[PDB]
Symmetry: D3
Subunit: 160 residues, 6 copies
């Protein structure tokens, strides 16, 4: 039943790291990546969340065609990439479009093929390899229930 | 003499149906189309209108090169696709860029070739063929005068 | 076990109908489609076949990213779109990349979702709607065994 | 030390002249160019400036990959294209991304190759050749110090 | 009645000057243009011609969507850009797709708007402005009859 | 003085690994990469070479704009990425366009910034991380003289 709006900052296939300045809603180029890598899925954040790192809760959205930076997509969670890096906690909720029956076979983390999960993991483990002062201390996939709990606490913190 | 601003939601060639949330101005992905079709022209709505269905009045803009979702174009009407579907009234005002002399030969509906009008009609008749609970009860091209009258009543309703 | 080379003429998303002149191997623009439609998959033909219509046997290839006109892909069949139209027999063998374990769950026609099969069918039923003298008398999905038999007889005829 | 935010209106390679309506922040298509030319760099304006013509101060940003219309980039100046045309003063501050060590060899106007400066000049001298009532009375490259002084007076005027 | 095959070397919108090595049929990058310009139409040459400069006769093809380098298009002439430059004679036959009724209103040079002809001329007059040792001594539009005569003598020379 | 023709198989930014079948000259999709990586430069091979692994000698070409698969570029070497992996020797000659004065400041390996060399290295070290049975035993940059010697022995072997 859980769904939420994701703002996509970075379309799949991008090496330009876009993002939003959350005070204004403007889209910003943070940087061009230093590695020859590209975002593996459309990437952004869940609107109206205050996450575990004090930032909006990040999201990955599986789509048949990418969007543009700044576009909203109603999404539902199917799992989460738990990661601790130099920022601190840096989890990414894995999502599919909400209300779209083409995605109904994808309900939980076991419904996403390992080839896809492994490629996503590889991106986050390596994309900052050529930036100084970066590290990854934990990176693991967890299930929809864990994802939903993180979204829930982050919605509550935003409202608090 | 009539001109108005159109916000383009969907560039020509798109199968992603973008959209604007009119309460906020945000661009949203409504859905990926279920048919192997693509918008035949840049598509969006006329700013500051309250149309016949209680929604902003839709517009099609003929252009030499598409824009991006959310971009404004000053436009003038040359005709209108009158359609009744499952939404109710669902007219699309056909437009060209205002103030651009390259378009001065296009003044009314007879100035747009049948091949183009027929392709536009085909899109709207078929793009929802693989969605349940959709229908098209009337679909016909009408002239600039009819278009202008619809814009006019919709500008008035918005202001009311 | 069956695999073959497909030459892709038309990448997914194209309204330019490319395609090969089989006497020379050159890529040709046949025409821009008359409907606001776009090829639903990468599309082309199986090399070294002489099909049921006396032409190379057509193929559809499911891919994570389209190719360019003229590119070869080693493919294996998973089913076939049987169609009779104004050309005569006009079957399209549905394929996935051969030797790619990411596709191992797709073995036969039941492994491709109805939403995808229906969209492909819709394309072939409608893309010539605005061309004179076109028709579709039969259009149905059949299984891998039927596909393989058609490939086999077409390889034999080419060699004969 | 000087840096500022540039809003890119027009990505490198565009013939669509996008954009910002400064009263609302909306992106608008001004026009399709009348010449077969394309913006030589990402192009836009410096936020929070009131320039010599009473408009926001224009900026060119050198980048490894273009952005989208409306995107912010933190930039630092390395020189300026001084031009007087039919608008009046129409200077363009030449910039590189701020805080990006890949650009540290570019500090002043002599660090940008003549081939690049000449191509940029050529664009501004010629892109309006097929529009009536246009002219260019002065077009010359000046150094970072001149650029910084113009930015400074324009920041002050905006604040005044 | 005249038609011929054009090989498109350079799609509309390109700054890469592709392309064919006529001895092999391979596509080559000649150079990236030195000016911030882009080919105004799809551009290439007429197959099986030996033109006035001893090279294949160049062609411009008006299309609703560009092709890829190396693609053939059956075309018919509607006029010609006569030019003398540093190569010598350097005429470009202006064409539309043959057998395509969407183009039937375009028969001769007067059927192509001045805005389009002027933009094409502008490209050829200026694209080599920043290359040494280039010049344009004559550049004028001529009619279909002149174009057809040039094609005819070039077909004859190729065969001779 | 050394120059040669490179056939580009893979444009910069690609995750499709194109590719040439050297017996026919056809372009083939080998595979979609298994990692979220993209070729860091245009990539291909030097024509008329028989390299150290018994295959054509691979090349990387620095360009302002990518080409298409199968396109020739006259190139000159400026260094080489020496690598031993599961294939055996797998060197990539680093090149710039020959005869193009915009590249005259790039003569040897020290003229290419470390950020760029490091990104290229990162690609080759990591792009097969999620393929079984792959390894990299040596990966280092060497100078133009080493590159030229490898090209020379490979031209000789091809001719032998």
């Amino acid at each position: 039943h859980m769904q939420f709006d994701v703002t996509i900052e970075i379309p799949k296939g991008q090496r330009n790291k876009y993002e939003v300045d959350h005070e204004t809603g403007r889209v910003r180029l943070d940087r061009y990546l230093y590695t020859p890598m590209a975002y593996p899925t459309d990437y952004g954040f869940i609107e109206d969340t205050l996450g575990d790192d004090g930032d909006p809760l990040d999201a990955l959205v599986l789509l048949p065609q990418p969007v543009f930076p700044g576009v909203l997509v109603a999404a539902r969670p199917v799992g989460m990439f738990r990661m601790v890096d130099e920022h601190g906690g840096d989890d990414k909720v894995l999502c599919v479009p909400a209300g779209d029956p083409r995605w109904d076979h994808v309900q939980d983390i076991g419904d996403v093929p390992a080839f896809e999960l492994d490629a996503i993991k590889h991106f986050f483990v390596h994309y900052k390899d050529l930036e100084p002062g970066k590290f990854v201390k934990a990176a693991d996939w967890v299930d929809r229930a864990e994802a939903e709990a993180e979204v829930q606490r982050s919605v509550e913190r935003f409202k608090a």
